[PDB]
């Protein structure tokens, strides 16, 4: 039960410090961690290595705004004066008898232009598709900054998870973000809710369409 | 210092074997740890093994040792990875790296990677879509306008191109990227923002062509009554 636990994202505009968090196992509450950053497009690149008492490992070519610090069983990467270049995947790292434990990596948003929310369009499923035995739920995302969305579906109150596939964002023409989410389902299914749900999720605030098959 | 640069192809067929290259440059001359690693959609990463190249002995991830083997050519500064008998489990960017020799308090580190290469273990061949209408609707869209579209689903490989009443109506078009769907087959949605006044009048035609399976489609998208 070896595990290294970060939170999936995490935003700050530029100029700004942030401060991430690698939480270790209480196995492994002693133990070295390295962090690491991906830049999109980007090769991996190591930042340094952070023992229990908080000595680091400056790494040649790795700018001086990364620094380590840890308390306990946390583990902690400071990045002050954020630039753009500093929108990345960071994700810390240990090693335990020949075994490399990786944690899930933060997505850490650097916002270099204002927030923007999106614009949320959603489609039933259309007749032609019905009459061909599916049915395919339409969720478009658009005009958005960061680029960073969840997005969940709602079968009338209920969460649903199985036949969803999401896109990961992609910049438009503009600097803002698009993304697309699709629900599949069986025409009976369809039919039988009272209204189907996509809940848009982006930097704390929530946009919700739903769509009733009785329209 | 060292350099790292993955290839090979992007596409692997479930049963088969996937093979990757790293061309390597700044290196030792002996006594290397290249490693490899790897990450899958909405996974951590995971370690597959190293091959040290002055011993010439590899080390693998347990959980993969059967079906890995890792190798060099010191003469064209290459290592190699070869992975049987994939499944969409092994679908993943593949990562070479090199380990550091300095086992600062206890941790051994990947110093140098490379950007790494997608590969998708796929069963889809040649497929054309199914084009269905999304007809106009006005709940999202400023005053005056409704957005409709058409779902160009399930076709392989990419791309399709999206024209609306045959290159006439290019304002208000937004054809929005496809997602890899798990079948490994494609689906992306068109859509175009037009005035609501002109629903009852102007016809709307979505001309879809799918250039690799030669299927053309030009479906009208009309209001729903």
């Known amino acids: 039960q070896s595990v290294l636990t970060q939170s999936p994202s995490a935003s700050a505009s530029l100029g700004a410090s942030v401060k991430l968090t690698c939480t270790l196992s209480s196995g492994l509450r002693s133990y070295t961690i390295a962090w690491y950053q991906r830049q999109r497009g980007q090769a991996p690149r190591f930042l340094l290595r952070?023992?229990?008492?908080?000595?680091?490992t400056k790494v040649d070519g790795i700018p001086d705004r990364f620094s380590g610090s840890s308390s306990g069983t946390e583990r902690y990467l400071t990045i002050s004066n954020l630039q753009s270049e500093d929108e990345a995947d960071y994700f810390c790292?240990?090693?335990?008898?020949?075994?490399?434990?990786f944690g899930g990596g933060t997505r850490l948003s650097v916002l270099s232009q204002p927030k923007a929310s999106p614009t949320v369009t959603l489609f039933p499923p259309s007749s032609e598709e019905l009459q061909a035995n599916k049915a395919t739920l339409v969720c478009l995302i658009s005009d958005f900054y960061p680029g960073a969305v969840t997005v969940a579906w709602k079968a009338d109150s209920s969460p649903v998870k199985a036949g969803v596939e999401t896109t990961t964002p992609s910049k438009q023409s503009n600097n803002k973000y698009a993304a697309s989410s699709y629900l599949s389902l069986t025409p009976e299914q369809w039919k039988s809710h009272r209204s189907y749900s996509c809940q848009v999720t982006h930097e704390g605030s929530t946009v919700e369409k739903t769509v009733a098959p009785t329209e | 210092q060292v350099q790292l640069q993955e290839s090979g192809p992007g596409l692997v067929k479930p049963s088969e074997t996937l093979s990757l290259t790293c061309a390597v440059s700044?290196?030792?001359?002996?006594?290397?740890?290249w490693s490899w690693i790897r990450q899958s959609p909405g996974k951590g990463l995971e370690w597959i093994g190293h091959?040290?190249?002055?011993?010439?002995?590899?080390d693998y991830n347990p959980s993969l040792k059967s079906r890995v083997t890792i190798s060099t050519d010191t003469s064209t500064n290459q290592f190699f990875l070869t992975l049987s008998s994939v499944s969409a489990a092994d679908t993943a960017v593949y990562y070479c790296?090199?380990?550091?020799?300095?086992?600062?308090?206890?941790?051994?580190?990947?110093?140098?990677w490379g950007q790494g290469v997608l590969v998708t273990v796929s069963s889809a061949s040649t497929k054309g879509p199914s084009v269905f209408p999304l007809a106009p609707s006005s709940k999202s869209t400023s005053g005056g306008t409704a957005a409709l579209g058409c779902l160009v689903k399930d076709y392989f490989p990419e791309p399709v191109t999206v024209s609306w009443n045959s290159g006439a109506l290019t304002s208000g078009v937004h054809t929005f990227p496809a997602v890899l769907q798990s079948s490994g087959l494609y689906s992306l949605s068109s859509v175009v923002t037009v005035p609501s006044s002109s629903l009852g009048t102007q016809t709307y035609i979505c001309n879809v062509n799918h250039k690799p399976s030669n299927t053309k489609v030009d479906k009208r998208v009309e209001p729903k009554s």
């Open positions: 790296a090199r380990r550091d020799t300095d086992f600062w308090r206890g941790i051994y580190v990947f110093e140098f």
């Open positions: 091959i040290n190249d002055y011993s010439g002995r590899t």
């Open positions: 790292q240990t090693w335990t008898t020949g075994i490399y434990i």
């Open positions: 700044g290196g030792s001359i002996s006594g290397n740890y």
């Open positions: 952070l023992d229990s008492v908080g000595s680091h």
